[PDB]
Amino acid sequence: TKEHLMLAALETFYRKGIARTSLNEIAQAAGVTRGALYWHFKNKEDLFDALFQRICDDIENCIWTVFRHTLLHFFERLQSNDIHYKFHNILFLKCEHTEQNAAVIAIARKHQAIWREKITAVLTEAVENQDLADDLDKETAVIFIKSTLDGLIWRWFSSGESFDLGKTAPRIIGIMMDNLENHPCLRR
Amino acid sequence: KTKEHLMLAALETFYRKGIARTSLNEIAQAAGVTRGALYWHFKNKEDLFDALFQRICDDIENCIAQDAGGSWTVFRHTLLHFFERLQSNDIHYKFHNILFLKCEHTEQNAAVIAIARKHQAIWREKITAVLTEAVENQDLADDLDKETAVIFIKSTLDGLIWRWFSSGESFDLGKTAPRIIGIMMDNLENHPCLRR
Ligand SMILES: CC(=O)[C@H]1CC[C@H]2[C@@H]3CCC4=CC(=O)CC[C@]4(C)[C@H]3CC[C@]12C
Known part of the structure; x- marks a missing residue:
């Protein structure tokens, strides 16, 4: 049930963006009444929340x-x-x-926060297995990892997928991995 | 004269409401300038934006010249x-x-995005030339893969910018940028996986 409402929201979000999308438009795409959507999702914010949740899950x-x-x-x-x-x-x-999108952005920052604590934990555990050095700057290392991954994602989507992500992503990731283990700039 | 005022006005409004939701008329209202004075400087919105990109680049x-030994x-x-x-x-x-x-x-923003993509291909070519001078100067290896390195540089830099804005400027860019740039330059100089 709820999964049908999420995918129409995702599909509408994908064509018009979040700002210029209305509940009305989502309920139509799913082919249900404005009343039926509301029972499951009280606003656009909540649909975006559930969608981010399915990605993380x-x-x-x-x-x-x-x-x-x-x-x-x-x-x-x-x-x-x-x-x-x-x-x-x-x-x-x-x-x-924009100010109109402010509740969405707050939702996205909530999920981004979880992603950060999880990276912080992985690094915390890696330092103990002697995979990473004991004087690793973990605060810098987590900004480093997210900035690396954000950059590839942004560069891929904003260039309209103008390069081969299957060939580029492993090389970027491997280099990142090398710098985390070895580069002195990532040490305290 | 007041072409600058229109530019600052467009910048402030784009910053307020985004590009798509901003109108030619409300820019001129914020600039203290008639509609016809705006068309006297700016045929439409994406030309305002193109003039903003140009100013950043200039x-x-x-x-x-002031940043300059070796390129x-x-x-x-x-x-x-x-x-x-x-x-x-x-x-x-x-x-x-x-x-x-x-x-x-979105489709509503298509003209502006085409403009943005034009200034980026110029930035692409400027990188490709920087790399090219650095191979001849022997600062980079003769078998550096220029096509990969360009994506690498743009990826690295886009990521830092995106991270900093997205996070609400929550980390010290003044301390992080030199580290990020340091590591990137080191990789271009030394890392095997950037060679062909
Ligand atoms: C002046 C110059 O050498 C140009 C060539 C490469 C350019 C950068 C390439 C990546 C990039 C993407 C942006 O969205 C704007 C800023 C930056 C970070 C550019 C700033 C200006 C640079 C550094």
């Missing part, structure tokens, strides 16, 4: 060496999975930071 | 100066904020 249910493979499969998924493609397209390209 | 290019060194200085300016120059902050966060890739 997808990534969770597919599981330091695991970290690498999790990064690799995230970028494959962007190409082969239609929902992950559209959601991150929407997040990066169709989600203006 | 500002950056104009510093390069691979100049590149490093231009990158560092860019993020410095992002922090200290309101026009450059607002413009890149608009570019990354207030310019939806």
Whole structure:
């Protein structure tokens, strides 16, 4: 039930962006009344919330060496999975930071916060297995990892997928992994 | 004269409501200028935006003689100066904020996006030339893969900008940019996976 309402929201978000999308438009695309949507999702914010939730759940249910493979499969998924493609397209390209979109942005910052605590934890555990050095600057390292991954995603979507993500993502990730283990700039 | 006032007005409004929701008429209302005076400087909205991108680019290019021994060194200085300016120059902050966060890739914005893609292909070519000079100068290896390195540089830099704006400027760009740039330059110089 609720899953049908989410995908229409995702599809509408993908064509018009979040700002210029209305509940009315979503309920029509799913072919239900404005009243029927409201029972499950009280506003656009909540649909966006559930959609981000399915993305994070997808990534969770597919599981330091695991970290690498999790990064690799995230970028494959962007190409082969239609929902992950559209959601991150929407997040990066169709989600203006205007005052109208303020509740959405707050929702997205909530999920981004979880993603950060989770990276912080993986690094915390990796330092103990002697995978990473004990004087690793973890605060810098987490800005580094997210900035690396954000940059590839933004560069891929904003260039209109003008390069081969399947060939580029592994090289970017491997280099990132190398810098985390070895580069002195990432040490305290 | 008052073409600057129209430009600052367009910048402030784009920053307020994003590009798509902003109108030609409300820019001129914020600039204290008649509609016909606006069409006297600016045929439409994407020309205002193109003139904003041009000003950002002029500002950056104009510093390069002052950023300059050797050009691979100049590149490093231009990158560092860019993020410095992002922090200290309101026009450059607002413009890149608009570019990354207030310019939806919808059909309503198609003309503006085409303009943005034009200034980026120029930036692409400028990188490709910087790299090319650095191979001949022996600052980079003869078997560097220029096509990969360009995507690498743009990816790295886009990520830092996107991260900083998205996070609400929640980390110190003045401390992070040199580290990010340091690592990127090191990789271009040394990392095997950027060679062919
Ligand atoms: C002046 C200069 O060398 C140009 C060539 C490459 C350009 C950068 C390439 C990546 C980039 C993407 C943007 O969205 C604007 C800022 C930046 C960070 C550009 C700033 C100006 C640079 C550094």
